Amino acid sequence: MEVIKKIELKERVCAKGTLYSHKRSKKNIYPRYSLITIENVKTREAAMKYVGNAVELFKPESTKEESIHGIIKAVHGRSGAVRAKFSRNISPVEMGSKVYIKLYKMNEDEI
C-alpha cells in the first residue's frame, strides 16, 4: 500500500510542524498566508535559518490531490513561529494538521 510507504519515506527525512492559524488581526483574516510552529525551534534567531525552505501538506484521504506544496516566507513574532504560502488557500477544516519541512530551498515562483 503506497500511502503507508510514502509516509515512512517522508518521516525519515523532514522536520515536523503544525498549522495553527491564518494571518489575522483582532477582526479580519488574510487567508493567503498561514502560520506554522516547528518542533524544537524556539527563538527568532533560530527560526531565521528556515526562511526559504519548502513545505508539504500530505493528505491521503483526499480524492482530488494527495499533496499541496508551499514555501516559508518570513519569521513571525519572538518565539520561533513562521509564515508560509501554498499553491492553494488552506481551509479552516485543515487547521491543527501536521506539516513537513523539507530541508532544501526553492524560489517563490515554483511553489
Partner 1 sequence: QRLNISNIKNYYTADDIPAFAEKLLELHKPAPIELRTDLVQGNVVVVLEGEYASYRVVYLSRTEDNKALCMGLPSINGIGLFEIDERFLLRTSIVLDIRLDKKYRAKESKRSFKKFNTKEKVLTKEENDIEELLLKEIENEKFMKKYFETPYEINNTVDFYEINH
Q: Residue numbers of the site for partner 1 (CB under 8 A)?
A: 2, 5, 9-10, 12-16, 39-41, 46, 49, 102-109
Residue 96 C-beta: closest distance to RNA, Å: 6
Residue 68 C-beta: closest distance to partner 1, Å: 12
| Residue 40 interacting with RNA (CB under 7 A) | no
| Residue 94 interacting with RNA (CB under 7 A) | yes
Listing DSSP states for 8-51 in one string gives HHHHTT-EEEEEEEEEE-SS-EEEEEEEEEETT--SHHHHGGGT
How many DSSP H helices and E strands does the chain contain?
Answer: 2, 6
| Residue 88 interacting with RNA (CB under 7 A) | yes
Nearer to RNA, 40 or 63 (CB): 63
- What is the rounded CA–CA span in Å between residue 17 and residue 81? 10
Choose the one of RNA, partner 1, none that binds residue 31, judging by a C-beta under 5 to 8 angstroms depending on kind: RNA
Residue 73, H or E segment: strand 67-76
Location of C-alpha cell 518565539: 79
| Residue 99 interacting with RNA (CB under 7 A) | no
